[PDB]
Design a protein around this ligand. Structure first.
Ligand SMILES: Nc1ncnc2c1ncn2[C@@H]1O[C@H](COP(=O)(O)OP(=O)(O)O)[C@@H](O)[C@H]1O
Ligand SMILES: Nc1ncnc2c1ncn2[C@@H]1O[C@H](COP(=O)(O)OP(=O)(O)O)[C@@H](O)[C@H]1O
Lengths: 321, 321
């Protein structure tokens, strides 16, 4: 998988030379977004899809929130270089042009766009039943960040404060594991802690644009990480310094998954475990950062960056990543 | 499909207000690219996939050129608003992380990027065997066009000259019809004019960046159209005026399709029929435009813009669209 993707990554890096010294000259690949040089500012560009969450949407017949998921997966990544999201295009590859599905998808696209402050400006619709067994929804978003205001993680230093913003639930990663582990055994109508299994699996991804844009315009921020594939391992994309953290108690769908045989260390590498976005700020800014974020969503002081390198210590679970 | 898509298009237009008076304010949806206002210039944004051509690549086990198709589909669209292509991201949704397929895909991605002059700056790889029966490749491209230099088609006038640039072959539209009509009847190893059927169906899409950028910097240009889905109907996106055209002889794979019973009026709405890109220039510029374009590829004087509003007359075939 990494082996396969490395072939494309290598080729993409070779193509950087084609814009060397020209408008659009890129930074490196591998971060939450690509940065393209437009002189006084960078354009930030990112691409992501919903994933197999859309199979749960199709199973129950509820498509009016997967547009929120797709917008969230893109605009939340733009935030992680310090960019203001501006615009998005969607790529909708479908087995058939079902009018009711499209109507529902459009509802969630509007709600997500309004929350993120972005215009949906175009896209592609491909009807290909020979290739697509469902309704696959992906997109590409662009944002803007002033030169000198990019937030890469390079400024993260030992001692910095690490703050987590609560997720809304499972978001859009780990659904293949959750689907296969739980649906055949329990049924989509199984009730767990007051919600049906499909409600746990379909709850739309949280959009962090409003709290994060307020944060970065108020306090010094050293790193921003959207918690997606790889779970807490995404922190290692920002820095090689270590982390010492306390994570929230395991609740909801995450507890059901854990009780069905997924060990905790694997959980923290797959699921967001209740924290959808992590910010790293100088310890001098910690109280104000917590104050700002908490006005939008439940937020937690998780811990600190350490001089110890490359380790993520989840102290209250006794787990090291 | 149109009634399904209408729901998403209506929502998209509703989100335009979210950037009203701000950086990134968009133009209207429906053209070959979205235009976003960045002050002195517009960013142009387009999204497109290869389509079921990838099933022919998978059938024969050759993905070495599908990346060219995806880059061409996107950069050729950017040209139609007058934009210089800058950068692209790819969306690769796959049934399995096949290292051989990915290495092959990477080869054509590099070749296409170099011919178009774009950097591949990022993307998304989604391994989703329950959702994808093959290797679906799409992407999003961005380009730049100066204010006052956008080519929308609004300048097209009756009497303007219409020039076609030859296609390389089938390009990336009509493959569903061609696959289902020809492959079971003839076999992928069927030889027609010295090429196997799979060679006809897999021939990579032509990239028009170099001829068109030279053209728009040399002569007055009123309209530019990449001949994709809908075939000649794409001309109607540029203008409400009519067209009087003579199309080239029906050759190669298009002749084989025609000889298997598809009517010509449908074929001119599905296939490019030998013309992959059409330019509309004032009559006074016709000879210079032909000289510039013909340096790069075989090009044709097709005909003229007329006052027969909304009609495309292919006079040498007796067809009206
Ligand atoms: N098919 C691809 N082509 C080019 N770059 C890719 C592709 N898939 C992933 N990438 C790059 O790899 C990095 C990680 O991607 P991904 O695993 O989707 O995580 P994220 O969405 O958090 O960046 C990103 O910088 C992305 O642009
Ligand atoms: N899923 C979608 N979301 C938003 N806009 C779309 C979508 N599908 C198509 N469009 C818009 O409709 C127009 C026609 O698109 P398409 O049929 O792909 O033709 P082309 O690729 O030649 O533009 C384009 O402006 C495109 O941006």
């Amino acid at each position: 998988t990494a082996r396969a993707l490395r072939e494309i990554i290598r080729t993409a890096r070779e193509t950087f030379k084609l814009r060397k010294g020209k408008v659009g000259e890129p930074g490196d690949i591998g971060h939450y977004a690509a940065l393209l040089d437009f002189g006084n500012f960078y354009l930030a560009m990112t691409t992501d899809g919903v994933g197999t969450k859309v199979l749960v949407a199709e199973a129950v017949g509820k498509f009016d929130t997967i547009g929120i998921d797709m917008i969230a997966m893109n605009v939340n990544d733009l935030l992680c270089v310090g960019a203001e999201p501006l615009a998005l295009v969607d790529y909708f590859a479908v087995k058939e042009p079902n009018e009711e599905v499209f109507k529902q998808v459009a509802k969630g696209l509007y709600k997500g766009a309004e929350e993120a402050g972005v215009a949906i400006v175009g896209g592609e619709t491909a009807v290909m039943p020979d290739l697509i067994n469902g309704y696959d929804l992906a997109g590409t978003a662009i944002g803007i960040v002033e030169k000198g205001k990019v937030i890469t993680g390079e400024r993260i230093r030992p001692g910095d404060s690490v703050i987590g913003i609560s997720s809304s639930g499972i978001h859009s990663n780990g659904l293949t594991l959750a689907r296969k582990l739980l649906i055949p055994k329990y049924g989509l109508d199984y009730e767990y802690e007051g919600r049906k299994l499909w409600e746990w699996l379909l709850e739309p991804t949280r959009i962090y644009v409003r709290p994060i844009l307020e944060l970065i315009n108020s306090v010094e921020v050293h790193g921003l990480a959207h918690i997606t594939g790889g779970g807490l391992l995404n922190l290692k994309r920002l820095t090689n310094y270590g982390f010492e953290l306390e994570m929230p108690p395991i609740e909801g769908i995450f507890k059901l998954i854990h009780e069905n045989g997924v060990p905790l260390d694997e959980m923290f590498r797959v699921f967001n475990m209740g924290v959808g976005f992590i910010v790293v700020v100088p310890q001098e800014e910690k109280e104000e950062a917590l104050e700002i974020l908490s006005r939008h969503y439940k937020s937690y002081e998780l811990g600190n960056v350490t001089r110890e390198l490359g380790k993520i210590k989840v102290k209250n679970y006794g787990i090291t990543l």
